[PDB]
């Protein structure tokens, strides 16, 4: 569609914000709050509905990992509960294939999931599928050519440079070439024939580096670094450009939104979020009403 939606996030505590940015005019619009605050969630879109998946409510009243799937209809500006996942998944990644949502990895307390499940909107049902070969929280996920990729994250002990691919017709995961950089909480998306991994945390520092995996050549190549180091950034693609939203730079919860032009191999600032935050869910769909 036409707007970049950012849902939830973290600053001091987990947030309920839903706001939409319009690249055509620079404008932000505040929309209906999530029913439950959450950070470390993912967003995605199916049939012009926006979905918020997993996360955790870090609050003064306590900390609750989320198994929730919630449905936002832009035509009505209302959130509806959808069926919950088998398990809470904080710092989750999601991918959409053929109108179905895959929920990948994430944590529940000290449990670091390798498990994966798939939601079918027409049935309002989740079903488990084959688990990843590695436990991954803070995992990045993207879809290219109807294959699902899980990239980086943290396995409970080490931050990971590894990545793997799920072949739905085989219900099977296989390792791909590892990244050149260890990354937990990177932004992962697809542009053209490449899976991009932007930023994240290597166990030491927040990263500004960006690298991309060419599915044909099976190699990762660095492109230009972002203007800001960031972990727990939101990422999405809007009209052939990658947008990265917020995150944490080791000092500040960023309001910076940056945009990547792959033809010039340059990042630039495009706007600021209305407030700095990390761990947001991001997706693109039609403008409301």
Ligand X SMILES: Cc1cc2oc(C)nc2c(=O)o1
Site residues, ligand X (CB under 6 A):
138, 184-185, 201, 206, 231-232, 248
Q: How far apart are CA 161 and CA 203, in angstroms?
A: 11
Please say which residue, 181 or 206, places its beta carbon nearer to ligand X. Answer: 206
For the bound state, the minimum distance from the C-beta of residue 153 to ligand X, rounded and expressed in Å, comes to 9
Q: How far apart are CA 129 and CA 141, in angstroms?
A: 16
For the bound state, the minimum distance from the C-beta of residue 212 to ligand X, rounded and expressed in Å, comes to 21
The neighbouring-strand residues paired with 219 are 214
For the bound state, the minimum distance from the C-beta of residue 107 to ligand X, rounded and expressed in Å, comes to 11
Pairing of strands 281-285, 266-272: unpaired
For the bound state, the minimum distance from the C-beta of residue 137 to ligand X, rounded and expressed in Å, comes to 9
Please say which residue, 69 or 232, places its beta carbon nearer to ligand X. Answer: 232
Q: How far apart are CA 82 and CA 90, in angstroms?
A: 17
Please say which residue, 39 or 285, places its beta carbon nearer to ligand X. Answer: 39
For the bound state, the minimum distance from the C-beta of residue 232 to ligand X, rounded and expressed in Å, comes to 6
Coil vs helix vs strand at 209: coil
Q: Taking the mean position of all CA atoms in its chain, how far away is CA 103? A: 11
Please say which residue, 95 or 199, places its beta carbon nearer to ligand X. Answer: 199
Please say which residue, 129 or 150, places its beta carbon nearer to ligand X. Answer: 150
Q: How far apart are CA 9 and CA 209, in angstroms?
A: 22
Which residue, among 189, 107, 117, 116, has the nearest Cα to 151 in the 3D structure? Answer: 189
- Residue indicated by tokens 């919950």: 84
For the bound state, the minimum distance from the C-beta of residue 248 to ligand X, rounded and expressed in Å, comes to 5
Q: Taking the mean position of all CA atoms in its chain, how far away is CA 187? A: 6
Please say which residue, 67 or 184, places its beta carbon nearer to ligand X. Answer: 184
Cβ–Cβ < 8 Å for 166, 150: yes
């Amino acid at each position: 569609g036409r707007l970049i939606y950012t849902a939830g996030g973290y600053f001091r505590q987990s947030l309920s914000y839903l706001e939409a940015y319009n690249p055509s005019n620079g404008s932000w619009l505040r929309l209906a709050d999530l029913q439950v605050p959450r950070s470390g969630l993912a967003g995605c879109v199916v049939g012009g509905l926006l979905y918020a998946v997993g996360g955790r409510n870090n609050s003064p009243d306590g900390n609750t990992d989320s198994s929730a799937l919630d449905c936002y209809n832009p035509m009505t500006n209302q959130w509806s509960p959808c069926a919950s996942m088998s398990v809470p998944r904080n710092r989750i990644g999601v991918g959409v294939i053929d109108g179905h949502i895959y929920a990948v990895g994430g944590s529940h307390g000290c449990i670091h999931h390798s498990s994966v499940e798939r939601y079918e909107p027409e049935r309002d049902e989740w079903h488990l599928v084959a688990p990843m070969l590695t436990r991954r929280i803070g995992v990045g996920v993207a879809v290219l050519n109807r294959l699902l990729y899980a990239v980086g994250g943290f396995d409970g002990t080490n931050r990971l440079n590894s990545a793997e691919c799920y072949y739905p017709e085989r219900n099977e995961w296989r390792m791909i070439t590892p990244m050149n950089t260890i990354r937990s909480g990177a932004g992962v998306c697809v542009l053209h024939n490449c899976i991009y991994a932007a930023g994240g945390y290597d166990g030491q520092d927040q990263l500004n580096s960006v690298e991309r995996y060419d599915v044909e050549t099976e190699t990762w190549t660095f492109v230009a670094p972002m203007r800001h180091h960031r972990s727990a950034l939101g990422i999405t693609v809007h009209q052939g450009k990658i947008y990265v939203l917020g995150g944490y730079d080791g000092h500040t919860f960023l309001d910076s939104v940056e945009c990547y032009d792959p033809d010039s191999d340059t990042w630039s600032e495009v706007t600021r979020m209305t407030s700095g935050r990390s761990g947001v869910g991001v997706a693109v769909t039609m403008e409301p009403c």
